[PDB]
Ligand binder design. Structure first.
Ligand SMILES: O=c1[nH]cc(F)c(=O)[nH]1
Ligand SMILES: O=c1[nH]cc(F)c(=O)[nH]1
Ligand SMILES: [Zn+2]
Ligand SMILES: [Zn+2]
Lengths: 449, 452
């Protein structure tokens, strides 16, 4: 088995059970997993490759828990930059009706590359449109080429124009076809073993874009197959009113009534989750993907993340799709979580270590994994290093960890995912990034024009 | 005088009176000024150097209107990261008491380098501590090394611990000495001419950090000398209560009472400015430096920027000191202004072009300058270029301008300040940046290990 030693980090942030932050720390890797973490004599360990991390901070790889990677082809569309969410959807859906399998494959790589260079080693996605023969398989193909640990969601919608919804009919599917494809994807791709690089989750776009029968049947299938459940919930005032008018229930009551609570469930946004919903989520272990930049850029609101954390809700972090952020920058999203909670709820609402915990342990938690999210013996070899001697962090070496959240760092210097060194001295190793960016921009131009 | 042609930008954002955004745009420069702005007809122009900007967006240089660059030596101090503003001040003041002239000279270069690589071509600063023989001269020396267009404020404090204030006495000054040094700095350094690289403003830290007499005499001096006035105003709930309690007045009423209104005045933050204060500022031309990251990082609040703009208030942008942001990233601050107004006031509150106008034309206005802030014949040759073919902007070429605000771009590819190409292919040309960063971090270490 291949061994790898990362030695003499200026600070090794473990996020482990003691929250050890080790000066001069070293990390010994064998295959895809961590052998030991420490300073002192472990730094003298022989290894097939040694990488010198003096002057760097090492953190556990960031974990992104919500995205729509296909939207990285359609950032800052003029008719979608401003205005109401109604106009945003109505101007973007006809564009997305042109998506091809190749664009799914390429856009997954582009969005994952942006996340990887900004500190992220595991990401979910929420692909929920399948025009022109597009399949989740195309996104899985792209993810496999770039080497990121991947939770692929079988997103779905069934309520289109003919049934009184907003999406064009060409962007919705029959519900029997959705369940059959969901089952196929689990059988073909879901790896439930420790250190899995690919897991499947089932994800109707929202409880309102599919039938209530399909929400219950999806939950049933996920529980039978041992996979997770993901959807958008309580993202804005319109979601809350819709739930009340149409079902006589708050969004959280609606989720509970469908069986969409539990540690195998995580809901994106939850900006308008109420006190009873927070408590329900806390006692059922239901997770939340917090997407601060999206919630600001779409004027959704400030999610009550501090209140959720204070009751024991499992909270992870997500960038959301690139047409509603529009960046894909994980460490910048972690910064935004801290800034937004403080402006919303005061100076004690979120510090650097609490935000970074959401970005690491919190994300592992809401994806229902205990093998990622911190650095210790037997954990997955997922971690990143930032150079502390850059201009961006000059004067911030008083606390290298806080520097990543309070300052604006550049790209990571190194990234390791499943023991593979995927970024070396700021250069992505698993793909030809300039070629992918070129193809992406040509495809984006073809799609929109 | 040297001539420069910048040709074939994918998009040249002028911010001019017609807000032209020119595909294939070109810029012809002579010395410190723009000779022409146009399309490919400019390619027939002769120039000493041509720079090919295809694949790039060019924008007017961003203008930063509030800072404390000395704080770039003390980012994320553990005891100041969290807690109340009281704890922030009382844990940072003893550290700043060890500042030396060399630290002022170096920290100015570090803070300006961060601003320049993130799109900024003009900055003010608000140095308000002068321990151990430090002088505004030291900051001016650093700014002259790096080539940034500079509005240096003689900040001041006189109400210390022994007199019932929070700063220690070693960090406050006698008020007559403050006025004397203010006049010396104006006479020695303030260049009032077009395309000036150095202007002086007078800047008591807040209306409560000095006597009422110093507030009034400082304004009197500034008006006599023709320079501007700068201070912190209405940053938080404590500022509003204090002025109401001690003076029976809102912060903006108190500023008016002190004579601290007018187009030669700009107030930092104004988070808690009320409707009548907004109206007052609009009709007097009083400016505002909006500091969104600082206002969130210190839990100050969401300033009513959309309301001020709708009433006619001149609003610029500021990163604030690096101990309350803690970044110095001008284009990221522009993004934050847009994100924060939307979450505060709805989807119509601020778009990419509105935010970029605050960061350019808005900053020129609050600094009382008509020669920077947009690209047109006779304007200062201050502009920057971002590469549009980066991973960060992939899929955003549908609107190159909005991409700068809605995405998170890297450093600029090129920067021109006063006609000098100060950043070339991402590399800062005017200082040895890794050497300055090394010295900065070493001085930061010496500073925090001082005996106190
Ligand atoms: O912000 C968003 N809301 C709803 C959606 F379906 C989506 O893709 N993005
Ligand atoms: O936010 C701030 N408040 C007060 C200060 F003196 C300062 O520098 N910054
Ligand atoms: Zn989403
Ligand atoms: Zn300030």
């Amino acid at each position: 088995k291949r061994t790898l030693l990362f030695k003499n980090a200026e600070l090794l942030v473990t996020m482990d059970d003691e929250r050890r932050e080790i000066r001069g720390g070293c990390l010994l890797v064998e295959g895809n997993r961590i052998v030991a973490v420490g300073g002192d004599e472990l730094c003298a360990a022989p290894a097939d490759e040694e990488i010198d991390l003096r002057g760097h901070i090492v953190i556990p790889g960031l974990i992104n828990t919500h995205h729509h990677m296909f939207q990285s082809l359609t950032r800052v569309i003029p008719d979608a930059q401003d205005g109401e969410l109604f106009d945003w959807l109505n101007n973007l859906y006809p564009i997305w009706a042109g998506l091809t399998p190749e664009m799914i494959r390429i856009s997954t790589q582009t969005a994952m590359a942006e996340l990887m260079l900004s500190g992220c080693t595991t990401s979910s996605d929420h692909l929920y449109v399948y025009p022109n023969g597009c399949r989740l398989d195309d996104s899985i193909d792209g993810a496999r080429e770039i080497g990121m640990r991947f939770h692929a969601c079988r997103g779905s919608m069934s309520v289109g124009r003919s049934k009184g919804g907003l999406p064009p009919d060409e962007l919705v599917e029959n519900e029997q076809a959705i369940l059959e494809d969901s089952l196929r994807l689990i059988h073909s791709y879901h790896d439930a073993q420790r250190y899995s690089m690919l897991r499947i989750a089932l994800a109707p776009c929202s409880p309102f874009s599919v039938s209530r029968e399909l929400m219950v049947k999806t939950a049933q299938m996920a529980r039978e197959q041992g996979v997770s459940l993901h959807t958008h919930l309580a993202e804005n005032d319109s979601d809350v009113s819709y739930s009340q008018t149409h079902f006589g229930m708050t969004p959280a009551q609606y989720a509970e009534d469908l069986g969409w609570v539990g540690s195998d469930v995580w809901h994106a946004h939850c900006v308008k989750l109420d006190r009873a919903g927070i408590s329900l989520f806390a006692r059922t272990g239901t997770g939340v993907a917090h997407c601060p930049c999206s919630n600001m850029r779409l004027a959704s609101g400030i999610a009550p993340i501090r209140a959720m954390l204070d009751e024991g809700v499992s909270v992870g972090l997500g960038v959301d799709g690139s047409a509603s952020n529009d960046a894909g920058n994980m460490i910048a999203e972690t910064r935004q979580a801290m800034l937004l909670q403080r402006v919303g709820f005061g100076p004690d609402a979120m510090n650097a270590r609490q935000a970074l915990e959401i970005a690491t342990r919190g994300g592992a938690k809401v994806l229902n994994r205990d093998d990622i999210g911190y650095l210790a013996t037997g954990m997955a070899a997922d971690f990143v290093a930032f150079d502390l001697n850059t201009l961006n962090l000059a004067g911030a070496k008083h606390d290298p960890l806080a520097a990543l959240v309070f300052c604006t760092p550049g790209n990571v210097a190194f990234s390791v995912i499943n023991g593979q060194v995927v970024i070396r001295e700021g250069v992505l190793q698993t793909i030809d990034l300039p070629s992918v960016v070129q193809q992406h921009n040509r495809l984006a131009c073809l799609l929109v024009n």
